[PDB]
Amino acid sequence: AGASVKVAVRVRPFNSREMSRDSKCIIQMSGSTTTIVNPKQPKETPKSFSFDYSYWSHTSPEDINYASQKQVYRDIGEEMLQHAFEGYNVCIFAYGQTGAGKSYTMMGKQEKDQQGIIPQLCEDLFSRINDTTNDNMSYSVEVSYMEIYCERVRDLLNPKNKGNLRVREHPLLGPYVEDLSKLAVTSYNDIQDLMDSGNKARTVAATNMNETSSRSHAVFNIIFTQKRHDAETNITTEKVSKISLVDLAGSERADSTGAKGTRLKEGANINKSLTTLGKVISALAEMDSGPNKNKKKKKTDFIPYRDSVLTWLLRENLGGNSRTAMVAALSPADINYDETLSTLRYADRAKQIRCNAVINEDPNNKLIRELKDEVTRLRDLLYAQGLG
């Protein structure tokens, strides 16, 4: 069925190094629109983009138009959990380059006053499950964590040698990975501990940009099984749902990292996978909107799932009756301009919509025009009544 996507773009208020320097902001947000200005070419114009959600987390102690963490969670996570508990699949992609702030939005700090998406998701999941454990109901939750590196799948939790797992297609259950360990969990603490254990196993390498840059996509999948004993023997599994928490490696230019050999191969494969994911997401949203409004069934079109392993494994979550939302982090310095604009260009995908320019009033010209109009109106009123 329909799988309408959402696009949210966040900003990350300055860090200690950027506070120490005299760097300036370049990103401004208003309504559903974001705008960025080239520091090296301040004379031409700003570039403007528009999304479903623009989150201005730049001023932490701000009271007006501050993108609070609970606001983001209410926007995406609560809706996706509610969709999951109805018996459907949901997915969350995390996109962004180094220094953007992806990890904060995905995980957040451990002070628990400003949490990220994932701990809130897990806590609400377990709270709901423990809430509705009546005599007839039973719930099971298990977790898997894998990575995709150069179009090869690897297991992050299993301590075996990092060999390439084989991808199969069960006729009814769709694509899957052989020998991928599936572990049951009983609280969000176990989920986060397993996340730490697997994150220690990621393939991270040093580039010309940062000493620790992700080189491989990662997927944390939560399988949620519901079993209800209606009056007889109906414990037979009513529904099984999937929560996908996917961490994308960011795109890159060979100019930024001119290293040859492994780095070029990794960059090329990452860019190919990201382009295919953009294409499949855009194709999925269009037919969506189309039907939702045209209710027609223009055959089933053809969504290119097979042009990459990443989209192939996520076929069940991306398509069908599902929900989707990609969150993008945009650093705030004037030095990372070449980063930030590119991120917006990737966020412009998934139902690229008209942005409109951000023209506003010039104070002097505004006052002159308004005063001239007022003079004209008052003069017309005087002349109409014979008082001029």
């Binding site: 795109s251 890159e252 230019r253 060979a254 100019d255 001119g258 070029l264 960059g267 090329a268 860019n271 190919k272 990201l274 382009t275 295919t276 953009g278 294409k279 604009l341 590119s342 260009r345 990737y346």
Partner: protein, 451 residues
Amino acid sequence: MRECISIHVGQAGVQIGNACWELYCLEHGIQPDGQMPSDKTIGGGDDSFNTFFSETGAGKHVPRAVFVDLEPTVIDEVRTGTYRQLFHPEQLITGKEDAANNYARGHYTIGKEIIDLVLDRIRKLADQCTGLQGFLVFHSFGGGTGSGFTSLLMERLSVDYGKKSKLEFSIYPAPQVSTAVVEPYNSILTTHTTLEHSDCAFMVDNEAIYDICRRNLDIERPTYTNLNRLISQIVSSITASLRFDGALNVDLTEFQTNLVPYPRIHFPLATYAPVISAEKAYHEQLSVAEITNACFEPANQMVKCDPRHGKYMACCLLYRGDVVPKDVNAAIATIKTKRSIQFVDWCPTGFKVGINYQPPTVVPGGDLAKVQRAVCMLSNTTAIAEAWARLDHKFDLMYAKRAFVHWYVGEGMEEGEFSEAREDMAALEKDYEEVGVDSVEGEGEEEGEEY
């Protein structure tokens, strides 16, 4: 010492260079092996003109040219051909594969490890020079090497040398005929570099040259040799002003000063008037008025665009041979009275004129007749926008579905770059539409204070 350094990139560049260097060797009396018997027979002279050739102690003349390519084939054809002993053995040809009609392959992946050698040899050639005037870069839009590697080379040259002029001769893709399915991507990608880093770009179209060959020279089945020879004649006409004496000499800086109103409008068209066969050279006078009129005929343009759909912003006429100023003045006056040729109101003067005494030479085995007079016209106009707009449409028709894109991303690009280039192109097109507009009626709206 009005010295120029020529750079030839890609197959089209190397072949045009073969034609150009044949013409230069024949103009100056240089043999294919580098010796000049004219000085030996006479006893000495200035015939070793330093614009193109550098003289060693032994009397050999080595050209000031740099050939670059990623295929060994095109330049191995030169290393074992007629002119094998003319060029310096160092020819800068990467013993690897080619850019494969891929901008990314020639700019990011394989353009490295050959760029350093190229700039080192260019530095060596520039150190030998006194009073270097500029660079002449020959390449082709739509190719992998000729687009990407030319982009990288131009960027590095603009970083290093800075103030020296960099003129560019390039083969724009034609409207209808093409030799590759991915021409528009490469052309739209390299426009973003040729706009910023060049000083004046001359564009030529193969459909136009085929039409000229069919109609004028009566050649039913031309090959690339004829087109390269015509382009060689044009470049020789451009550069003649700093090799031979004349009544009015026009250097390479006067070019840019007179033909480029604003920095982003440096895309003039080029035409050559007395393109005629030997048989039809008779039954014709070939006076100054005839050739000047023929320069303005739309059929003779070398890019498939109609000047009648735009406005002329600048013209530069370079005459060769038995030409005198009064006929040039009469021809310009006659052209100024025609209503089909429109000039922008903000350029009352319009014309630059240069005259050179040396008549054009005939290449044995060629197809152009021997003539006493010739003119090369260069016209900065607004019709060129049409030639871009078509290409833009083609680009859109492929980028809506992201066809052929994964080849580019696999070689070190990202998707957004494409969009960026396209946006730049629109801006450039918009600029043309803003400069051809007539000045607002009584530009200071209106006026008329007391007395």
